[PDB]
């Protein structure tokens, strides 16, 4: 027995992006702080490209299917 209108948070957290009721994504946004310049740039959780630090020109993120690996030790807050 389960209510379909007041579903558990966990359950919906497991389900597939499009299966959840209100239906929302997983992607998020993050302020990255270069390993040098320090500049704080916003990068999308699913960047589809390599990202440079507009200050110096360092490498911050490498693209993948879904996740974006962050180059070396750079900082990252999840804006939400």
């Amino acid at each position: 027995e389960r209510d379909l209108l007041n579903p558990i948070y966990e359950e919906e957290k497991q389900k597939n992006k499009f299966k959840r009721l209100i239906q929302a994504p997983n992607s998020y946004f993050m302020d990255v702080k270069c390993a040098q310049c320090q500049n704080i740039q916003m990068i999308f959780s699913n960047a589809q490209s390599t990202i440079i630090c507009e200050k110096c020109s360092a490498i911050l993120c490498k693209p993948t299917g879904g996740k974006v690996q962050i180059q070396a030790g750079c900082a990252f807050k999840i804006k939400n």
């Binding site: 027995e1 379909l4 209108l5 009721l21 209100i22 239906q23």
Partner: protein
């Protein structure tokens, strides 16, 4: 693709009462789907129901009493003069006692029966008993 979601929603629901589901989630929903729903509700077939706001085209959840025996639509929604009624009443309904053949009119949507009251009716929509 999809078509007459009223049909999409309807059978999904029948499959419900038939399987003994405790409640149902209808995915693609419209004014029609909802009107039909409150008409079944009003006549006492389905229970309380909630419409969730899918920012695209709402999702509805209908509680299942356990009195729905069958509720479907009718292929092309033929036109039906008031004279064409008994034909369909003896046709679709399991008796001269559960008269529920929903139709579309200019006067909105009425029960198989209400259409005789208002005296107009028009195109068939669906049925439930």
């Amino acid at each position: 693709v999809k078509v007459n979601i009223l049909a999409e929603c309807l059978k999904d629901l029948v499959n419900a009462e038939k399987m003994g589901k405790k409640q149902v989630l209808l995915r693609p929903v419209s004014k029609v789907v909802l009107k039909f729903l409150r008409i079944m509700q009003k006549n006492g077939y389905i229970g309380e129901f909630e419409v969730i706001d899918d920012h695209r085209s709402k999702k509805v959840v209908v509680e299942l009493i356990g009195r729905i025996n069958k509720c479907g639509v009718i292929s092309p929604r033929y036109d039906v003069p008031l004279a064409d009624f008994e034909k369909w009443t003896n046709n679709i309904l399991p008796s001269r006692q559960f008269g529920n053949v929903v139709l579309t009119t200019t006067y909105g949507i009425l029960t198989h029966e209400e259409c005789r009251k208002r005296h107009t009716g028009g195109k068939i929509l669906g049925f439930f008993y």
